[PDB]
Structures are given as C-alpha cells and as structure tokens.
Write a protein that binds this ligand. Sequence first.
Ligand code: IHP
Ligand code: ZN
Ligand code: ZN
Ligand code: ZN
Lengths: 34, 167, 48, 107, 143, 299, 254, 290
Amino acid sequence: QLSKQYSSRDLPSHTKIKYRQTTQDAPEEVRNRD
Amino acid sequence: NMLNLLIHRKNLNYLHLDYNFNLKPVKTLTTKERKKSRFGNAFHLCREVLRLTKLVVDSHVQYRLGNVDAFQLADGLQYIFAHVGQLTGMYRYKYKLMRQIRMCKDLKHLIYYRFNTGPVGKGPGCGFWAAGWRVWLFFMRGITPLLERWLGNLLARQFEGRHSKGV
Amino acid sequence: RVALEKSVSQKVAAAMPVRAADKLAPAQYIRYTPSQQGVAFNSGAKQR
Amino acid sequence: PAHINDFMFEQQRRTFATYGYALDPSLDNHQVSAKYIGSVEEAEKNQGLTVFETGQKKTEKRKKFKENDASNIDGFLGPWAKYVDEKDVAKPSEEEQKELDEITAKR
Amino acid sequence: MPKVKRSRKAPPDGWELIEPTLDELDQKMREAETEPHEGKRKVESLWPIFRIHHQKTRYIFDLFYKRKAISRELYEYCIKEGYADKNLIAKWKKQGYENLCCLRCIQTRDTNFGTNCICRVPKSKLEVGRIIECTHCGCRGCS
Amino acid sequence: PIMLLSGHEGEVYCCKFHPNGSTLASAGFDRLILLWNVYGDCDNYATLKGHSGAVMELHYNTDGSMLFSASTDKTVAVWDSETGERVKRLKGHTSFVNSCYPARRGPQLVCTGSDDGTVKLWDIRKKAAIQTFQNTYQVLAVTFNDTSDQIISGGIDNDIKVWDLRQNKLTYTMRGHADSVTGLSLSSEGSYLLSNAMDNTVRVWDVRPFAPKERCVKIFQGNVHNFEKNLLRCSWSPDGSKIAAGSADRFVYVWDTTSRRILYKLPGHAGSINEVAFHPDEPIIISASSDKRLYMGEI
Amino acid sequence: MSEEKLQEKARKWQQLQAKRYAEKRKFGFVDAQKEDMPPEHVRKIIRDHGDMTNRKFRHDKRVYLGALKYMPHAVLKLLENMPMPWEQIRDVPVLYHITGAISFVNEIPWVIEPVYISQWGSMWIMMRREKRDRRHFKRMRFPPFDDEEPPLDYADNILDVEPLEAIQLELDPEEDAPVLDWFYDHQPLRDSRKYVNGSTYQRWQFTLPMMSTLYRLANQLLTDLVDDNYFYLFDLKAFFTSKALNMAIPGGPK
Amino acid sequence: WEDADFPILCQTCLGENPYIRMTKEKYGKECKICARPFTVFRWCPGVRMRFKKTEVCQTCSKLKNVCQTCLLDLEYGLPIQVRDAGLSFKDDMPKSDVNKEYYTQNMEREISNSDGTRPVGMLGKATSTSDMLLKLARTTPYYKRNRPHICSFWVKGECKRGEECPYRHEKPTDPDDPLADQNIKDRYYGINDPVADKLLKRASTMPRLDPPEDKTITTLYVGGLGDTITETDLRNHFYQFGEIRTITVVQRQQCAFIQFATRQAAEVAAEKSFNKLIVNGRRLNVKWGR
Ligand SMILES: O=P(O)(O)O[C@H]1[C@@H](OP(=O)(O)O)[C@@H](OP(=O)(O)O)[C@@H](OP(=O)(O)O)[C@@H](OP(=O)(O)O)[C@H]1OP(=O)(O)O
Ligand SMILES: [Zn+2]
Ligand SMILES: [Zn+2]
Ligand SMILES: [Zn+2]
C-alpha cells in the first residue's frame, strides 16, 4: 500500500555524502594520533 | 474535457466551466457548497494556461477560416503575447509571473519604438511576435515540472484519498 | 549495507513517483508440479 | 525457476493446441522416454506432425471469396475477404427463442 | 474540397487519369469516417478506415508496379500528398507480405506476448476453419 | 567451492579449457566467445568477437595457440589466442556448420561437420577445401582419428561413419544406437571414442587397425532428451577414468570407465547442461548450461 | 530401419532447426519500428469520444482524467511549434493515446540560424511597409469565439477550405537568385544532401552567394558595429564589477 | 498488497495442455474477501475456453486452503462448506466491516511468519480426510467450467457476430434452479450456498451400512466374498480392528459371518468397510447378521 502522493520537500537534494578528507580529520589520522 | 471530468467527479454539479475556461456557478451556493467547491492553485493554473493556448489556437483558426488576414493574425498574436496580464488573469495563482509580464513590456517598448521610427505610426499593425513568444515558452519550460507535481498530488488525493493517519 | 541500501532504493524510488519506467523483464519460465498428480488430469503428464 | 529455449516451447504448445498431442514436458529424475501426451493415438496416426512443420494434409479448406482488384469502388475485399461458406445472419430460432423469453421472464 | 494540396507544385501529368478514382475514394473515406458510432460496437467502429486506407494505397501500388501505368514522378507526388502510404507499400514489396491488412498487425510491441495477430497466421496451419477477426483491422487472415 | 560463473547473455553451448589448463573459453547464443582465468577467483579477462551466428562448438589446438570455433552462420573461424583476432574465416560451407575439429599432432588440418550434408576437410593455409564426403545428410559431430587418416562423424541416421583420407570411401560404419547421435569424443588413448545420443544411452567404441568387427564396448544409462533436442556433448577424463555427460535434466552425470556405475548425478543447475569440461591437470569440472551461466565443481 | 522414416525425419528436423535458428530470432535483433497510422484514425477516435458523456465509453473516463498530469507537456510541445507567419500550413508529427486522451506534438523545431534571421527580417520589412500603406488596420477580437459556442470541427470547417495567402515578401529574381525558391519553405533544404546533414536536420553547409543574399536580406534586424570596443564599460565584466561595487554606470542596470 | 510467485489453483482450472502461458499484473485488483489489492494472474485455459483469473488474495487462500479462482478445496475439491462439515471444522472469520478488516490484518501479520508450505491453523489440525469427503470427491477434471458464458444476444437472437459470439449460444438456464445464484462472498464464507446443500443431500442418500437393533446381534454378514479369500484374510480385515470372536466363511454362498468381541470395534470395521473393503478386488457387503 504505497501512495503516489509526494512532497515539495522530498525532491532529491544533497544527493552526495561528503567524506572527511585527508587533512580535515580522517579516521586514519585519528586512529594514529596521540 | 479533463477539467470538466474533474469538476463532475468531485460531485460538484452546481459549477460548470464554459468554453473559454471560465468557471461559473449555475446556482447561488450555500456555505457548504461555497466551501466544498473551492479549488486550488493547481486547478486554476491549469485552467489559465489552457486559456492562453485556446486564445492562440483560436486566433489561428480565424486565420484559416478566412475571417481575418495574414497581417491581422500576426498582429493579433503579438497582441496576445504582450497582454497576457489583461487576457488570462494568470498572475492571481502564481504571482511570480510578473517577471515574465514585465519582460514582455520591456521588449514591446524596444520593438515599438524601433518599429515606428519613421512615417510608421502609433497604430495597431505591429506583429513581430518572436520575442514575447520566446518569453512564454521559457516560462512553460519552468512551470511544467511544477504543475506535473501539483497535478499528480491532486489526482492521487482524489483517487486514493487523503492520508489523515500519520501526518 | 547491501540489504539496507536496496530497501532505501525502493523507498526513495517511491519518492520519485515520476517513475522513469523501465522495460518489463524478459518473460520468465516456471516449471510447476501440481499436488494433484495422476492421469485423471494433466493429460497423464506430471509437470506443466 | 526454469530457463528453456523459446522456439521450442511455442512449437510444443501450438502442437498440443492444433493437433491435440504433444511431447510431454515432465523432466523426471526417473528417466522417462519421449511419450506423446494428450491424443496419443492421434500423434501415432498423424506421425507427430507439428502445426509449424509442413505436412501433407488433404483436408478440405473452407471456401472463401477473393475480390482483390482495388479499383472497384465497393469491390475490394482484399485481406478482409469473407469466407464463402459463412452464414449471413446469426440468431436463435422459434423454440429456443420462446424458451429464452420464458427464462428471461422467470428471471 | 479535395485533399487540398500542400506542394503548390504542379502535379506530374498522369495525374489526370488517376484523379477521379482517388476523388471518389476520398469521398468514400470522408463518408465512412463520419458514419456515426451506432449500436454497432466500440472496437469495430474503426474498421472502415483501415479498410479504405489499404484500398487507396493498394490502388496506387497497382498503377505503378503491376501495370507500370504511371511515372515515378507522379507516383512520388501521390505518396507525398498522402494518398498512398509509404511504408505499407514498402512492406507489401516484401516476400511474405503481399496482402498485409494494416501496418499495426505486425507490431510486436503492441501485444503482450510479443507476436502478430492471428491475422498473420497462414490459414492452413490453423485448419480449424474458425472465423478470425483481428481486433485491430477487422481483417480475416491477411495472409 | 561451487564457483558459478556468469556474464553470458544467452545460453552457453560450449565450454572448454586451455590445453594448458590456464584459461577458460565459453560460448553460445550470444554470438561471442568469453574467456576467463581458471584459477584465482575464476575471473574474466578477454572477449573474442565477430561470429554473426551462434557459436555452436569451440575447439582448441593441442598446444593452445590458435582457437577454432564453429558458427551457425555457415562459417568456421580460427583465431589467435595470442591476440583473439581472426586469422581465417573458413567460408564455403553451404549450411550450418555445427562441429569443428583441428587435427592434433599432424599437419594443420580441420574437419567440420555441418548441416549441409557434407563433412569438410580444410587446410588453414590455402583458403581452399581439401576433401568432402557427402554421405546424404546433416552431420552433427566430427572427430579425427589419432593417425589423422580416418575421420569419424555422427548425424541423424544413427550409423556412425568413418572415412579414410586416402581412399575417401566410407571406411567404418557402426550401428546400434536407437536414435540420433549427438556427440563424439575420442579419449586421449587415441583409441576409445565416446558417443552421446538422445535416445537416453551412451556408448563406447574403439577405432583400431583390428577391432572385433562390432566394437560396441561399454554402455551407460541416464541421459535424457525432450522437446528441446538441444545438442548434447560428452567427454573423457584426461585419464580415461570418468565419462562426464550433460542432459536436459539439470543433472551433471559423472560415470566411470571401469565399473560403469553412476558416480554422480549432481544437481545445481537451472537449465539443460550442454557441455562439461574436464581439466587436463586437475579434478576440476566446468559445466556450461542453458541457464546462461557456468559452474566450476571440484571433485 | 525404415528409410522413409529417416526421410521424413530429415524433413521434420530440417524445417524445425531452420525456423528455430532463423535470423529473425537471433540474439540482438530488435524488431524494426512503429510506422505511422493514418490521420483519420485519430480524427475518428476523438470525434467519437466527443465529451465523455455517453455511457458507451465510461471506462476511458478514468484514463481521460488521469492524463491531466501531463497536459502541461502537451501545451508546451504544441506552442513551441506554431506556424511562423511566412507559412500557411505546417504538418507536425503527433504522438497520441489510442483513446484520444492526450495528443503530444512530437517534434523539436530546428532552424538554420542565418536563414531564420533573414526570414524574420523580411517579415520586418513587409509588416512595416504594410502598416504604413494600409488605410485602416482592424484588430481581431479577443476572445474570438463566444463562451458557449462549442469549438469547431476541423473536418467540417477547416479541412477543405483554401488557406488565405501568408506574408511572403516577393524576392527579386536576379539579386536573390540563390535563395528565391527555397526561402519560404518550412525547413528549407531538408532533403538535399549537398547543403544539409540529412533528414534529422543538423549541420548546414552553404555557398558564399547564398550567405551574401541571406545577409543582405536580414540587414534590417542587424547591428552595424564591426568590433568590440564599442562595449567598453558596457560588457558583462563591467556590469559584474559595477554590481559588486554597488555603483552604476550611466546607461547600465542597477 | 500481496505479491506471489504463481497462482495456487485447481488442476481442473489450470488447464489441459502441459505448456501454459500466463500473464501477471502487479496490484491489479481487489480481493473480493480480503478487500485489499492483490496481484492478478490471467491464463487461457484451453483452446476456445475463457481466460480465467485469480480472484482472491493469496492470504485469503492460504487461510481457508482453496484454489484462488476455482474456490474449491485443494485436496478433495468440494465446496468450502462441505469440506468444513466433513472435517467438523468451525471457522470463525469475522463478518462485519471493521472486525473483518482487523481480523484480516492480524491474520496476515501472523501468516507472514510462516513457511508458505501448508494452510495456517485448524486446516492442519483437520486434515484427517473422512471417508465421506473422499466419497464425495470429484474423480476426473470437470472441464465444463471453462467454457464461455451465455450470449444475451444469441439468447434473444441477436448474436450477429457469426460464430464468434462471445458467449455459448445455447439455451439460458432457468433462474429458478438453486444452482444459479451463488454470490462469491457466501461461497467463500460458506453460508447458504445451494451447491453445498445439494451435495450434502447427495452424501446423505449415498449408501452406508446400516446398524442393527439388538446389542446381541454381534455377527456381521459380509456379502460377495469369493473363493480367493481365506479365513485368515477375513481375520486380517477384522483382526487388529479390535477383536474377532469367530469367523464363518460360507463357501456355499460366497459370504462371511464375523462374530466380534467388541461392538464398537466391529461397527467401526464394517461401516468403514461398507462396499469399500477391497481385499483381492472383491466388493464385500458389510452388514449385521441375523
Ligand atoms: O496596453 P499596454 O500593455 O500598456 O500596451 C499599450 C499599447 O501597445 P499595443 O499596441 O500592443 O496595444 C500602446 O501602443 P501604441 O499606442 O504605441 O500603438 C501604447 O504604447 P505607446 O505608449 O507607445 O502608445 C500604450 O502606452 P501608453 O499608454 O503609455 O501610450 C501601451 O504600452 P505601454 O506599456 O507603453 O503603456
Ligand atoms: Zn490483426
Ligand atoms: Zn490488420
Ligand atoms: Zn490482416
């Protein structure tokens, strides 16, 4: 029982996840750090 | 036919949409019907867009029947596109239209005040309808996904029913 | 990750609702063994 | 979930449809032989002929018309040529007619 | 009042002997087009049109290929103005397809199992003498 | 492991190993030839292209240097496993060429069985035919004899036929199969030859200078046919120890040369198994089935 | 075993194998096409359904309604092909629903750029000389049809009429030799592989006399500037800067 | 919404050819009982037979254990009421709107936790097929079910479609007959379905062995014995069923007379054997002797 209604706010948006880059604080560095 | 099928499916027999897409009641309606029979901006935006196209295709039918002329058709089309504000009444339902409306005024002041640079006069016969046509085509490029969403929602709600459970 | 995201994909494709309708998958073939086997019905054969 | 070949399934089905016998499809774990199922004696006497395989049949084809000159204004039957051995009206007759009136009254 | 012509080019000059046949055929098409939707049926109210359409293009197919009684130029003018049917013809010219009823009776995607009408099955391989009315064209076994 | 391979769009009819035991070739309806690496993850490196019809039989040379592949479109093809590219398009076949066999350890020479009514002998270098024994009818499988001087063929008339390359007459005709023979494969003995036939029986024969005049040796039960009449193919093991067969029953049949017992009827497939491939080195089995994929069984 | 047995065996298996591996059901073969219907098919369906009030249909009611979601597409596709005052009639490819519920003009109006500007420039000259030299211009009435006059039928009212000469400018035979014939066509050189790509109508290539006459014809709608230092502080970058500094040059935007 | 792999149908209704071609439509219609949307499968039964369609949810099927279109039981194949009575079942599925939608929701939630293998509930606890059920069962496929309807036109004369009349151009059945009006809802709920009552009267008129008056008449007469039976064979017929006290195998009349040790044992034996004790192919007639 799936509706075909819809919403202005369920349009696609921010469809890519940012990942924490090499210098910002990647889980590798924090794995290292003291 | 689509808009009439909508009107009559909701069981609103006291209203009727006439052939230039005017919506008119055929009674005087009590409160319950003045309320039950209010419509939204989807219905009315679709109504008014269809009214613009009927104006256009009927100018062309007048041309093809022999009633007017090539020049009268061209200038009447230019007229139509310059004066969408006073012929449709679209701005009531999506007021952002005035972008377009102001644009088709600016163009007309250009073209006119370059059309009649010499002995040519301030009279009607100026149909160079490329510019306003372009403008309303870009407007339609923008509006079709919006209206397809709004009408999809209206039709769904009319055929499934409105969901008052987990709002 | 696999199961999660596939269910995501179906739930969001619901939120597409303008379904970029893909073609219908090729016709499948299924082989069926009735419980009511015998030569009374199935023209004496067992499977269809 | 089988996966079979396509010309062959339709061949066998049309066989069983228009001839009444067919190479039975049971793929049993006990090795059965090719047995013509359905009208077995028909498969025997007809030599297993398929509706798709050409075969000798002296069967009287129903008589049809043929008006294929497309210049006659009301002439061309072309591909829409009726069968000549066909009826010109379709109705039930005096006894069944009154009986059906009686039934429609009984209902 | 005829199929008023778009080309504005002069018709090549066999046009004057095939003129009246096409004219009466268009008369018949307009008439059988307006014939109003009686208690006839809803599937079969469109069978006249396909019937007439085949006729007209069939006719020209004769007068160019089976008689060679008109020129390439006149025949092309008669296609371009919508009397004939370019692809119904180009299909007729094939080998298994001499009498094809309507061009839609071979559309494989318009039918759910991916086949042609029973219109298209040779009468012999059915042999059951059963009346065939392809719902599309109304044809009785085009081939 | 089971190691099922996929990546083929339609039935795979033929699968066989590198005679190295290094690379895998499979082919079928999709009109192209896929290659894989047998070891590691059983991964796919190359795909050969070109054959317009269905690849009905692929065949190696005995080193593994050039590839032979019989196509439905009246043609055989030899290609370079070095490149994957065509060296020769054996045209001239007047119908469906189903079976191909390159001469092993002799001069480079090919016998092709076809649906025209002829068996054809071809030299790769001349772009011309060598010999052709028009018996009457379709020949469905063809294999040489290790002398490269007789040629064996099996078709619709159930009498397995062998021609002498020098006298060019029907050298050896053998009889006893009740219905059409679908597969021949001569063991690496150079002597024992294996015959599948959809009458549900498999047979073993032996081409020698001297044979008992009626050389129907061993007989096994189990294979199936049905409305499909797909082409069923058999093989010996590298050792002449186990015979592997497929059938339209979804069961890989593994029997033994010695006790003719049913060592295996293995399930696992979805559609008819058309070809089983034995590893020239290992106890590795590869099944090509009409379910549009392959299996890599280890025994 | 019986010979005639084996002979009809060869017969049967030959036919069977032959059809089964016929090129028709080869692997990647895709069925050819969907070619055009006749026009009267559409015309008859739509005039039949009329206004869905006769209960004989009563099921296309649901699809008729449900097709509303797409009518802003039909309108956009329709209005972007309107026939351009040098033409009397334009024929367009139409995709429609087999119950008449909706009708999409299925086309994109590609034009050659210098041709198009020249055609509209001729229109400029003609319109102007006409409005100057017509005694009294009558403006048509909007709406042209009344509120309860039902819309006309094409077939009964416009189908057979003669269509009333359009706004051609009449080109002179000597100086405009290279264009006089194909100028006012719908898609001028559509089918002549010397000057156009093909029938999809991309890629023009033209002769230099063609271009010179086209230029001279479109001369009215054109700038007689030759270089760029006219727009000195009047280009995009000057405006970007002025906007950024919130100062505004004499004749520029704010 | 339901979602299935195939229909679940009677062999009668599935057709005759081994090779059938069938179409699926996802969320295609509404179960006439479950009231919710289902997937609807449509197949052509045979040559010149109406296309049939699955007409009840897969859950509405598994619950009462029937064929999704034929509606008859799956093993025996009688109307739902008959099977219920023969299994002595009491099916408590609600009737009113809200209660029935609620019951359907929870029954579906609980059948989600199944294996898809056998009916849920008492339909497993009632599979003891009584000889009455086996006795009423259909034997061969009554394939008259799949022929087309009755042509209103051809009943009035009008079926001018030649031979293609979309309905059997025969005589319309008299509407007075009880076997005419059986609404789907009742035939699923088993409340006053005429075919059930006619079949039950038929099962009541069917031959079963009669009981005697006196308790002391503990000799049971089996008629139609034949001389291929042994006294030890008549024993094995009536030995472990209780205890037998004596056996007289009358060879001058081809009959037998079994004196038992327990009245209920002999009664169960003979009634359960009535005309159907088929040992070495002999129709023995089990009755109480004089
Ligand atoms: O009614 P509007 O949208 O405002 O357009 C008109 C009109 O244009 P149409 O010819 O399309 O009706 C006039 O044109 P002419 O009278 O020039 O022929 C005129 O424009 P002019 O000012 O140039 O006369 C007039 O303007 P106004 O009321 O100021 O005279 C006005 O255009 P505006 O947008 O200029 O008002
Ligand atoms: Zn048809
Ligand atoms: Zn047709
Ligand atoms: Zn036809």
